[PDB]
């Protein structure tokens, strides 16, 4: 079945979007239809996976004869799925026998006839709390358009026999013929591997039917649903023949246009007008300058002065294609915390053709760019900062990518004076350098690294997280790994690389509880018991 997501213009758009529809994936809204302008623009639709909004319809008759079940994935305002209001004489809603979620509203329909006699009790399901049907089993159009009372367990509208393989509309989903309460699970747990595995028989969920693959432009979500587009907290990633909604790693890629190219083409700096157009942005395409005029405010460009607290919007920037030349920062801030999370400055375009990460004439105590790892093309000039102390420490040869990259770090706070004032790297830092006066702002860690922070030593033997060192970094062990005092508590990551298990141990892996009732191979639920040795034994 084909599925679908001026008065003349509205009618044309609705006829284009609902001519061939059989199951409506979103909400069917039939609103603002001119008189004697609709003619069978939508009659084959049989499943509305949302809300039916028939409002302000001047046309005399909207057929909607084939719509059997309106699911209720949303509501008009609240518990409002069928919205017949402010409209029309005959609406032969013949096949609609059940609306699963929501209620039907009747109001401001003086012209509507024979709809007041329809037994709405069967159509609505337990959502009578908002059943405002105030504006005999027959849907109009004389005879043969009867309400077909059937209600006043995977079949919603009605049954064509006492078999789940033959039902009009499935209650939750239908794999191919049988109405299943859930899709064939994507991951199946195998007692041999003691872990969930991708089941060949598992199928993704596409609306109200289980599909082995999601056709057209449909993305498989985490919960197995095949949504049209990935959510805000997810990203589109193709690993197999079907793309999946990969969860975003912090801020997801939202390539904005930088100052100089695009909407901010002729802008001079990051003015208050230019700001707030870069919120929740990463991989800013172009340069991203902060000239003094941004802080002062300008008249000939009619830009109000930028409050210092508004520079924190840029914190999400994880890359810059052009040059990131920050020539004036608010003096009340001691470190360039605005660009703290920057990771790579590709430097495709260079300020004056030379500099790619220039911080000139600021009053910042420390550069504060802890996350910066690569400055690809241009050179780097960090001068004029009379209070920058932890500056020359960082090995400028390590971060740069091109051999021609230089460094002109001069005129900052004296290194002799930096050491005299106690402004030196915290002892837990490798000789590569230090981005700031704190352990977190360390170019490389001397012994271990609990994340960005560089600790003296991981909790190999004693500690609350009980890390297990790996690649000169501390990784918090799996929660089931009970801490061990005689030796380390876990060889590596995962629940199967731990010596002592706080909870029960299932095969090689240590889990909170034994697998009980989980779906396994051959569509059989798996239940496992635990012995005195915390070993999870399959039943």
């Amino acid at each position, epitope marked *: 079945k084909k599925v679908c997501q001026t008065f003349e213009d509205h009618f044309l758009s609705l006829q284009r979007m609902f001519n061939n529809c059989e199951v409506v994936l979103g909400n069917l809204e039939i609103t603002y239809v001119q008189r004697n302008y609709d003619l069978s623009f939508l009659k084959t639709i049989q499943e509305v996976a949302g809300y039916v909004l028939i409002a302000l319809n001047t046309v005399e008759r909207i057929p909607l004869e084939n719509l059997q079940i309106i699911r209720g994935n949303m509501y008009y305002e609240n518990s409002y799925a069928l919205a017949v209001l402010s409209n029309l004489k005959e609406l032969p809603m013949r096949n609609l026998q059940e609306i699963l979620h929501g209620a039907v509203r009747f109001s401001n329909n003086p012209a509507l006839c024979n709809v007041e006699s329809i037994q709405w009790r069967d159509i609505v399901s337990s959502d009578f709390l908002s059943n405002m049907s105030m504006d005999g089993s027959c849907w109009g159009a004389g005879e043969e358009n009867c309400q077909k009372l059937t209600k006043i367990n995977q079949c919603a509208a009605g049954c064509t026999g006492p078999r789940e393989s033959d039902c009009l509309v499935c209650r939750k989903f239908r794999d191919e013929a049988t109405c299943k309460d859930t899709c064939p699970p994507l991951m199946l747990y195998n007692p041999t591997t003691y872990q969930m595995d991708v089941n060949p028989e598992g199928k993704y969920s596409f609306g109200a039917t289980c599909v082995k693959k999601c056709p057209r432009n449909y993305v498989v979500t985490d919960h197995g649903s095949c949504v049209r587009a990935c959510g805000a907290d997810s990203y589109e990633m193709e690993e197999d023949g079907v793309r999946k909604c990969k969860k975003c790693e912090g801020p997801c890629r939202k390539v904005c246009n930088g100052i100089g190219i695009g909407e901010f083409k*002729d802008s*001079l700096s990051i003015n208050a*007008t230019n700001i707030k157009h870069f919120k929740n942005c990463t991989s800013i395409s172009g340069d991203l300058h902060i*000239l*003094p*005029v941004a802080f*002062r*405010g*300008d*008249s*000939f460009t*009619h830009t*109000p*002065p930028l409050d210092p607290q508004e520079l924190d919007i840029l914190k999400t920037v994880k890359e810059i294609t052009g040059f990131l030349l920050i020539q*004036a920062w608010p003096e009340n801030r001691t470190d360039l915390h605005a660009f703290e999370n920057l990771e790579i400055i590709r430097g495709r375009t260079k300020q004056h053709g030379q500099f790619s990460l220039a911080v000139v*004439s600021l009053n910042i105590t420390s550069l504060g760019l802890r996350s910066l790892k690569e400055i690809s093309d241009g050179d780097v000039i960090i001068s004029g900062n009379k209070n920058l102390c932890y500056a020359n420490t960082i090995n400028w040869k390590k971060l740069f990518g091109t051999s021609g990259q230089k460094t002109k770090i001069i005129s900052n706070r004296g290194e002799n004076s930096c050491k005299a004032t106690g402004q030196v790297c915290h002892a837990l830092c490798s000789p590569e350098g230090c981005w700031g006066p704190e352990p977190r702002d360390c170019v490389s860690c001397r012994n271990v690294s609990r994340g960005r922070e560089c600790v003296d030593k991981c909790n190999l033997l004693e500690g609350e997280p009980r890390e297990f060192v790996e690649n000169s970094e501390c990784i918090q062990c799996h929660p089931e790994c009970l801490p061990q005092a005689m030796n380390i508590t876990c060889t590596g990551r995962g629940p199967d690389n731990c010596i002592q298990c706080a909870h029960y141990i299932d095969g090689p892996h240590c889990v909170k509880t034994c697998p009980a009732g989980v779906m396994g191979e051959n569509n059989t639920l798996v239940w496992k018991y635990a012995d005195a040795g915390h070993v999870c034994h399959l039943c």
Partner: single-chain antibody
Amino acid sequence: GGGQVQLVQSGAEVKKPGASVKVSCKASGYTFTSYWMHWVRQAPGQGLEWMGNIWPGSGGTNYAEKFKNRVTMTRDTSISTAYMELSRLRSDDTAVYYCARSGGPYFFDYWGQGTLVTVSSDIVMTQSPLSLPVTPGEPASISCRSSQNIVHNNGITYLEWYLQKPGQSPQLLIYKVSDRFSGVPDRFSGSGSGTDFTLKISRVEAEDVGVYYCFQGSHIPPTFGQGTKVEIKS
């Protein structure tokens, strides 16, 4: 102790019809690359008229439609001096061309000395008074009317009044529709809203003599009014 922002122009230019003149403005005491050097001209018998800016940091100029094809402005960041070359000198170009410096909340804050380039062979704001004389101590008031509403989309009104005291380049008096700039006594106190603006001097003193030009910049090309040459009745 912070360097007094003092822009100095070339000055004393006399040319012939159809010629080209280039005037510079040596900017000193300020980072010449952090404030636009907007250039304004005041013809004899006419008020201030913006002649387009140049942002000395990048050299990217804007320009005035009345000179879009005649005047080019270029920056020289090394010497901290902007330059403005007006080509095809006509009879009506003989005037005094000044170099402003558009500040934060006020345009043409610190103005240069001014160059008299004598060559010989748009929201319209009208100032209601003109050569309105007052008595020493007697309060005076000049009203100014705009062609349209001078309320910018940003919500800030870029209306101002510059008091070119006799023999000096204009100095901002009312930075915004109401605010008075620093260094100006409380005697000057403008008012207005919508499209009507009037400046009320609390007590016309000896120093206040000089043509108070009212400028509106909330439109693209900022335009100044005719200016009321307030003079002592006595």
